Automatic annotation (TrEMBL), chains D, F:
Protein name listed in UniProt: Terminal oxygenase component of carbazole
Lineage: Bacteria, Pseudomonadati, Pseudomonadota, Betaproteobacteria, Burkholderiales
UniProt binding sites for Mg(2+) 1: E99
Binding site for Fe(2+): H182, H186, D332
Primary gene name: carAa
GO molecular function, one term: 2 iron, 2 sulfur cluster binding
Organism: Janthinobacterium sp. (strain J3)
Amino acid sequence: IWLKVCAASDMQPGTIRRVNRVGAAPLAVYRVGDQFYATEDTCTHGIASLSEGTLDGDVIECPFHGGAFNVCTGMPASSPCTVPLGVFEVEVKEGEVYVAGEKK
Amino acid sequence: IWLKVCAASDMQPGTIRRVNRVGAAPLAVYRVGDQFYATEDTCTHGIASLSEGTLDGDVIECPFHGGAFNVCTGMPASSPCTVPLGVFEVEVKEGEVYVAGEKK
Amino acid sequence: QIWLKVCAASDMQPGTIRRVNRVGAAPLAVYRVGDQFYATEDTCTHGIASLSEGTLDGDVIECPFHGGAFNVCTGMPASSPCTVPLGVFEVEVKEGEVYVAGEKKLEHHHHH
Amino acid sequence: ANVDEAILKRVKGWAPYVDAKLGFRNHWYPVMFSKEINEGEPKTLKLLGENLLVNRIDGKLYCLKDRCLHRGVQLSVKVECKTKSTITCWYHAWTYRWEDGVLCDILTNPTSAQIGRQKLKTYPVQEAKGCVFIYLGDGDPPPLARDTPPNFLDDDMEILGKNQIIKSNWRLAVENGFDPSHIYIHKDSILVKDNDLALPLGFAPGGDRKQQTRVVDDDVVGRKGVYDLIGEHGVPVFEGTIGGEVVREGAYGEKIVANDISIWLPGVLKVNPFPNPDMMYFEWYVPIDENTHYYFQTLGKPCANDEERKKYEQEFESKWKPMALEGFNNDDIWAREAMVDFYADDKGWVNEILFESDEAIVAWRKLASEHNQGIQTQAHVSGLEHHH
Amino acid sequence: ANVDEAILKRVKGWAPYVDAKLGFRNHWYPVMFSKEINEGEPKTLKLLGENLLVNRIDGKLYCLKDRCLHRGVQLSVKVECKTKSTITCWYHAWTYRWEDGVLCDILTNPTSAQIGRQKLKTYPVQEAKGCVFIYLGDGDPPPLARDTPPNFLDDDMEILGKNQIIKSNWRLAVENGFDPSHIYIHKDSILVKDNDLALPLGFAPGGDRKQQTRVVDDDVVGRKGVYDLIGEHGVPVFEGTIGGEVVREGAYGEKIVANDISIWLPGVLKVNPFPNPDMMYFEWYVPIDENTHYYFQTLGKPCANDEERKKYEQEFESKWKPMALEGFNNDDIWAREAMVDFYADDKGWVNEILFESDEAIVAWRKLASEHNQGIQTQAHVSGLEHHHHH
Amino acid sequence: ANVDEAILKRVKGWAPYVDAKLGFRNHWYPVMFSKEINEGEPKTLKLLGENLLVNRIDGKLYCLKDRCLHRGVQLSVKVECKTKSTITCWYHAWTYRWEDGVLCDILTNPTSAQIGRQKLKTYPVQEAKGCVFIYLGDGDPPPLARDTPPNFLDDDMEILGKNQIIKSNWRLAVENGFDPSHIYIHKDSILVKDNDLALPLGFAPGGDRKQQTRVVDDDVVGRKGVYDLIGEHGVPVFEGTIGGEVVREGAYGEKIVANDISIWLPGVLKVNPFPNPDMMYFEWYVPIDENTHYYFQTLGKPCANDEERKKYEQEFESKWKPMALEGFNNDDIWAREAMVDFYADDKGWVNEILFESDEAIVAWRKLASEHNQGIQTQAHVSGLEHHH
Ligand SMILES: c1ccc2c(c1)[nH]c1ccccc12
Ligand SMILES: c1ccc2c(c1)[nH]c1ccccc12
Ligand code: FES
Ligand code: FES
Ligand code: FES
Ligand code: FES
Ligand code: FES
Ligand code: FES
Ligand SMILES: [Fe+2]
Ligand SMILES: [Fe+2]
Ligand SMILES: [Fe+2]
């Protein structure tokens, strides 16, 4: 149900971590300041990896075409992206990062 | 010879007032500060009502294509207007505005 | 005629240009950058304009025809469309008198 | 914005209209006649600058954008409908459902994560009166009645018509059609003579500006249009004079047509009655791109049975189509084309010198500006843009 | 104005000329021959980007802009001249007087307030030497002589010629004509052989810069032009060499032609004498739009009586026109077309690499820049734009 | 700077490539076959937007820019080669040497100070395998091998081909050729049936991204390119399905071709073996201008002597050329043209929706952006600009 990803300190502020899942689409965990968020890693506009894009605040910018998403709502922030990203709630307990295994 | 327009006080500086004359073309009365002026209401470049335009200082801008005239001289101030506007004598007597029946 | 007498160093104001016509040869241009004097061919290498009729901006002369420019010290192009270097002629002041060389400098017998 | 901002600022009375070079989005538009598209035979066309594909499956029409999501090629370059309900792009085999445009399969990679996660744009299509209408807009469409002139959809109204592509912006077409004084170009029409029509050369306006037209802000179905009332208190001109001398005369026929003329959004004119006392005429000027439009002509006549419809169709083909739709309106075609240069650089919208009868055109420009459901932009064509 | 400011800033010596892509406004221009416009038969043409209509009424020519004031359609789409002195637009019947362009009537609404209050643009028209000149400018025109080359208007000068549309900016035609060294493209012209002409391949300049030309800015008639004086101190080239070996030779004929060449505003060349020792040649490069021009060719030969005039005309039709105007000048046509791409983006005006004989062209660019009577702009075409004091 | 900066900023992963609308400067490019240019017979051509003139003097090829330094006219309008080693502009007789472009004489003015002080642009030219290569770059050129695919220059490799002008930007041609899934468009090619080829419809990728290709930047001769390895872990698709039902199958021939496909800078594809198990295929997409390219097709087959070379040529003319170069690749031509509209406004580089097999193309875009030797600009064409 919940996926233990890593220690909060494993990620510097403003970075993104790709979380692979056997037999499933990869996820991207974003560290925005001291807050953590998660979405599907694949941009809904193509095959780009959002974990290889640029994070500006709480908005992830895709490396391929400049499309963007709000990592909290998963809603498109910039064209050409139109299909909402799958969001996954994350929780940090005892300095450990956990991401819901179910798209919620 | 003269027509009763309105009370000089009913007009705020920088405002326009249309004067519909029975059996004749309409006129426009402009209040530039504390001085009053009058011209034909119809723009010479078409069929627009100048009283529906914008007054900037002593220049009236037509709402149709942006043409403009100096309300004192009736001369064109902005293209596409090229034909002088008919100016009518204005007189203020005992707190009331009066406009001459015929142009100057 | 190795050295051509141009004028008195005091007859030229800083930032000015003077044309030096020569019998049987192309004209030269003498530039006064501050207290120093330089010289090159007067004819722009890009066409038939006279650089002495151009505008001097520091040590860069701008051609009046197309806006091309050169460095008066090196004679190298400073602005397009100029691409061919100007011939540079040595200038010296003897007794406060400006003299320009009759032959241009060459990549001969000098620093490597 | 499709026009220079300096120009839009000048035309304060109808900037949205002047900006609507590509037409108005979110409205229904007729593009062809039902008989032109048969079962399983996809048809191409361009509407509001967009390339579209229309197909008839089990009798019902479906509309897909004619541009593959992958590399942007038109699917129509080489149509491949491999199953009754889909169309496969000829390039990399991305396959879409006509029903909802969903990318349901990719023959070149059946395991692609894109399958079921992308959707090709679709538009609502409806057939009425033998005409095919496409809602070039987003979201659930409004009733077709909103975008059609009154009575066009009347149960007993039998519609017949003609369609073709004309080289002029759609607006020049609209304005010419609703232009009260353009009647002058029809003075020598064969219809006027052969159908003994009364036709003045123009009108000497009467009454106030407000009485020259009748704007309809809302109909029972939300229609938006303007009626030309220049003939209400205006004086029909039958003798054209120059320096007091008569140089031309109107037509003193006995048949009175065009009792009322009205223009409706998104851009369709209704002339009643026309070209004969017992008929009704409607014509659309559909935006194809900024330089062309469909000139969709329709003639209507109430018919109670099949015998009347049969008789009507015979009269249409043998008389009304060639004498009216062609013999009359052909002059409207080159007239529209004559205004192209003046407005091509968008400067005509500033330099035009209007006279009295143009009150009708002005009323249309502002009604259109105030009630259109959206301005089509080049971005809608290539792909809406937006950066956070 | 009509060109990128970055480029104009670079051509400090003749920016106005480089900016005059559409030609110079306020000058007279020949557009057709008198015999081409008949009584009551309006003719269309485009001059400086403007569509015009010319009509002959009672023998006199009148010019009206071919664009109705109402919806901007060309009146010529369907000409309706309902009375001798007017033209009625085919659309809504706005009617204009040929003599002053005043909107005198409107058949679709004889009560319109616009009647008598609007005026369609008119342009002065004058016929001279069987040529139709239009003053494409505003206000009362200057005398025609100001915009014509010396002697063109001489009483005894019989003028004959041809006109056609050429695909190149007018300036490229001008500089091709006034070019001293372009004479090379004419080395194989039939006129050279068939009329036994003396024609060098080029010229080796001599003297100083100012001696290369004669700038005329003191002409009592107001004429403004430049005389090409390259042959005055420059030895003509009759033997073209490469590496010292002669590869081409000029023509060694008896007839001496082109003693003097001059270019005059607004853009007319005079070659004297040419194509024969007893004749004078004049050619105009009239701007139609930024890409085209009328190549108005005129040939003059003094004549005292009708007999001489006819002999001249017969001679014109049989020898001059086909051997000179065509056999010689046709090479000038594709020559100016060849320069289009280089100057199309306006960059040619910066990257051109000129040589000695272009000194004449440079003088012309400066004279044209300083003495033109106005820069035609696209705004003049669509409708002047302005907000007065701003 | 050939593309709107806003677009370039969006494609951070390969901006240089998207900007290279006119191609990459400082690379060798084939433009014609040796047998097409004869002794003292000047040929005109446009490469990377520049008009060029090629000539053969004493058997050696020379290339001069086809634009007189004087008034910028093309010398080719009326070629005048007065001496064997020079060309004289037909206008004012400025004469240049083919060998170094130096303005050596001026017939209209032998005393001109410009003589010997101006130089017309020249470009290195090299003939190899019967192909004429021009180095459209500045300074000393690198070894030809750097800009040619592996084995093209092998001693025994006999090269035969065809060349033509295609109306599409060069990059669209490159991506179509290196496209793993476009193979779908060749399913009905006569080459497949007539040469008993095994040809799937597409590929279901396997393994990670890194494994989808092999980026080559360690080649000793300096060539830079990408190998398409989608077939190493990817399940070739032979049964195309829609809704799970087979609607089309690939070709089950015995001959195995295209085991390896690679694209190399400046823009040449290598398919091996093809179109036969014992042959090698290479094709260039040379930029002529922003809208067109030369489609330089070459087929190589090892030959030990003249008897074999002659045999191969006969097979080429009667089979390979009509069956492969044309019967197979003709579809690649209209395919390329079909993508023009989408990418013409440069918006397609932003709105394209890619899928898994495009991983190869993306690798090429990055390699090209990183290893190209320069971006050709319109300034290179009109004349480089720079202000002090
Ligand atoms: C030299 C000699 C003759 C001519 C010339 C320059 N330029 C010309 C232009 C037109 C006609 C003849 C000539
Ligand atoms: C498989 C089989 C043949 C080809 C291919 C993939 N890709 C190609 C690109 C150009 C020419 C031929 C081919
Ligand atoms: S693949 Fe992410 S914006 Fe296109
Ligand atoms: S109607 Fe007033 S500016 Fe045109
Ligand atoms: S002549 Fe000096 S820049 Fe051209
Ligand atoms: S462009 Fe249609 S599937 Fe690739
Ligand atoms: S456009 Fe000429 S009268 Fe209306
Ligand atoms: S344009 Fe070539 S010599 Fe003048
Ligand atoms: Fe009509
Ligand atoms: Fe000539
Ligand atoms: Fe292919």
